[model samples]
Structure formats: structure tokens, C-alpha cells
Target chain A: ALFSAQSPYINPIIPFTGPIQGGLQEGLQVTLQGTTKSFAQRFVVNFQGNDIAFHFNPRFEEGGYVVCNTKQNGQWGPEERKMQMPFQKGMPFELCFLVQRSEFKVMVNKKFFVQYQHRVPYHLVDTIAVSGCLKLSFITFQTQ
Target chain B: LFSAQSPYINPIIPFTGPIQGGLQEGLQVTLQGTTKSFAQRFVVNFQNSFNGNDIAFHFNPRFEEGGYVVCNTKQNGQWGPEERKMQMPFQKGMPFELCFLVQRSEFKVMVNKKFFVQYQHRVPYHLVDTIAVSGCLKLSFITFQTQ
Candidate 1:
């Protein structure tokens, strides 16, 4: 007798629109593309609980974008490493990440992986934002 | 002594070829091109309990041939964001992510976390066609954890 593997349960599609606020301190991945005239400015990814925050800064002039994961809650955690990629006009770029966990894994364009340690719990956050000029797309969360 | 590499759980099934009927559906993945003209597609068995929401991460350049990639529900083979169904955008040597979700009424798609689009599910997932991914496709699957 031959054995066949059963398929996993696939959920129904739930379409959503507008800017949905993300949970504070939760794990997330922000992927985007567009033209930016500003450099060295900080683009916030998600809002930490209350007044805390997480953001990525432009480290180089002509790269896709620089990612800076920072913490303002306790002032004990170190700022994360800066990641760089080539920028393209009107093209899509993605940053896959895992947050609210012990470690942070961010992959740009699925080509490279940048890892870091989390300083604050992700549960403290409820909103996410982007501060630069880039066409925005869908943000999908990995169900834990 | 105990050694475990951790058990594997697959949210997306790897397709060997195009599938027919209700048995194949609801599978997803991410693709990367090491070279040019590397084309592959898979037939997936989508369950009647289909979550139209999906994310595709493409980490490559839009070649001259202009690689084509899209997701098909059970109702129609190729459904885009709108009733017109537009093609997903691509860029050369750049990383991109496409997020698409099927609501009870329509489909929503975003490119690179930007450029949102919408479409409708033709058939109730229970009566729809299985998912078939083709063309010069490369992407990743991001499962949604609803709070």
C-alpha cells in the first residue's frame, strides 16, 4: 500500500485595507520601495509602548535603505547593526523579520539575513509607521 | 543523549507540476534567482477554508523577458488585485515583497509594503479552483498571526 501525505489546513482569505496599527513590541517585517529625497533621516517602523520607538536610519547615500533597530524604553539595549542594499526606482524591496522574540532576524530581498537581540518585549507596541517617500504595500504577520 | 533538529511544519507545499480539481490548493513559498530564465511553477491544493490573505517575497531583478508571477484561486486560474487583475511589478537587482489577501468580498494586494490593490474571489473557496503558480516566479510565504 502507498502512503499519501495529508495537506495542512488553509484558512480563508481575509482582505484588509488602510493602515492597520500593529501591536507594540510585536515581531514584524517591513518591506517597501519608492523614491526618497531625504537622507540621514530616521524612518520609524513601529511604536514602542507609550513613548518608546523602533526605527531604521539611512546609513549610506545610494543604497536601498539602512535599517536601525533601536530601543528607548530602558536605555540598556544597544542600537542594532546597520543594513544596506541598492535602491531601485518604483521597485519593491522587502525586509523579513521576527520580533517580540529573543532574537531579531531581518532579510532584505531574501538575499541576506541580519540578526540581532531584542531589548524590549514587542507586546508593548500597537502602531507601525514609515517616515520616508516610498510606495507602501501589504504587511503580513507570521502567525505564531 | 537526545538530538533533535526540530520537526518540520509546512504551511506551503512544494508543487511538482500543475494540478487539477479540488485536491490541490492553499500552498505558498518564496523564490530567488541565482541565474537568468529560471522558471518554475507548482499546483497547490487549496482548502475550502481558504484565507485569501497571502504574501510573496521576490528577491531578484526584473529581467528583460519580464518574469511573470501571480496566484490563482479555485474560481479563476489568474486573479489580480482588481476586477481587471493587474500584473505584479518587478525591479532589477532589487528586493520586493507582494502581500495579497482575500476578504469575504475582494482581494487586496500590496507591492513592497506599498502600492495596494484589490480583487474579488470568483468562487467561494469551497467551490473554487485550486491554486496554480507559474511564470518566472520567486517569492516567500509570510503566515498571518491575527491578534
Candidate 2:
């Protein structure tokens, strides 16, 4: 039998909010497919609980950099910025987040993008939120 | 810049590959292609083994019969009842994206990003090992992802 809660969320609105299904577990993956607005400057996909467990922020303002960080107890952690941006305004892109035992591995357009170590127990991060300047086509959750 | 050697990259079709870690809940296979101007039919199959007699899921889109799709399973060379979904979401000479998401009870299908149909398992889905595609379509890519 196929798992009942594993359905993909299709063509969701920006600032989409939904349960992570069975919570984050090892070998689970989350895929986000969408295109950036032509005049977009930034966007974010966050995994949250009491605080942001993983915050993926892409900023086109700083001449195109991707900042990854974590927040706990209302305090933000140091940002890990990737100088190069893999996203282009007005173009479609695919982003994947693969949950590992220790970190969340991210990929953009099917390419390895970055990895963020878990600051809180990943299983406690039960919701996924996407916001800012982008048109999301789909967000899918898969667990092995 | 994107990594040139991402393992999750799309595959070229008519693609035939092992279902890495085997089919299970949360496995999804996506096919993106364009139908020929004179397209008649195309098939996507999940079989027990490569060129094997058992098929866990057979998804056939026929432009004939007023454009209905047929779904079935075959075991030991015997086919199960034919389940048809009358709505044809494809058109001649147009591009489409079809996804088959394996669930605990059925295969949830989506066409062009819209929910299409659900096919309950006639045989064990986890037994499916190979995915094959054939017939009148120009496949752009076939991609596989498992959680």
C-alpha cells in the first residue's frame, strides 16, 4: 500500500504552508519546483517548528548570493552564504531538500547546492513554508 | 552554477533502469514529452523485471476510442481487468508532463500538473523493478526520485 500522507502539493500559492507529513526523517526528500518573478529580488523556503530550523534565503540584492542559516529561541545563527547564485529571474528552477541524519542536503535545478546542519531535532520541524517573490508550481514530499 | 554530475538528473528515454531501492511509498517517476501530430498511443509500464511477463502497472494512453486511457496489471502473462479513465489530457503535437506517484494504496497520477486519476495496486507495487516507455511520443526526459 502506498503511504496516504505522501501526496504532493501542486501549484500552491506563494507563502505556502503545509505539514511536512510524517515530519523529517532520514532519507526523506522535499522538492520545490517554480520560477522566479522577472523583477524578483529574494525568496525563502523555511522548515519551522518553535523557531526556524532551516532557512534557505536566496538574495538577488547582494549581487546574487544564497544565505543559509538556522534560528532557535528567536535567535538567528551565523549565515552561510554561497557567493554564486544558481537561480535566474524569470526562469524556472527545481530545488530539492534531502534530509540526512545530520543535515539537510539541498539541490537547485538537480544540482548539489548546499547543506545545512540541524540546529534542532529535524523531526521537530514539521512544517514547510515558502515565501517572497516566486511563483511556485509544486512542492512534493517523499520518504523511503 | 548547477553541478554537472547530479545523480538525480533526468534520464533520456525510451529509458530502462532499475528502480533504485525498489518501488515504495513516496517514489515518483515523471515523464515529460510531446505527442506527435499523428499520435495514436503511448505506454508507461512498471514491470516485475526487465522484459518480464509480470507488470505491476501498465498506463496506456490511446488516442483512439475517443481518447481514453487504460490501466491494468499483468501477472504470469494474464492481464487483470482493464480500468479506463475516459478523460484524455493530451493533444496531438503538444507537450505534457505526467507524474506517477507511488502511494501506500494506489498510484496517484497527474497530467500537466493537474490531478488525473488514482490506480489502486493490482499487484505488489514494491515488486516493480523496471520502468519502460514506448509508442508515439517524443520524450524529452524521464526522471526518478525516491524519499
True contacts kept of each: 0.00, 0.00
Q: Please, what are the lDDT tens digits per residue for candidate 2 over residues A28-74?
A: 88889999999989998999945898999888975577877788888
Specify the highest-TM-score model's number: 2
Poorly placed runs, candidate 2 (over 4 Å): A1-5, B1-147
Q: Ten-residue segment with the worst summed lDDT in candidate 2 chain B? A: B1-10
Interface RMSD score of each model: 18.1, 24.1
lDDT of 2 by residue, B33-121 (tens): 88888988888989877448778898988898668787878888988655556558888789999988899978989999987766778
TM-score, model 2 to reference? 0.48
Question: In candidate 1, what are the lDDT values of residues B21-110, reduced to their tens digit?
Answer: 422123212222222134333222333324333311112222333343333333223432211112325454345554444345444455
**Regions more than 4 Å wrong, model 1:** A1-44, A47-50, A62-67, A71-78, A86-90, B1-147
- How would you encode candidate 1's per-residue C-alpha lDDT over A1-144 as one tens digit per residue? 212122211221222122324452343543333343333233334434434445544444433345445557455233333334434444456655556365555565776444444445656555555554444444555433
* Chain A superposition TM-score per model: 0.56, 0.93
Model 1: residue B136 alpha-carbon error in angstroms: 54
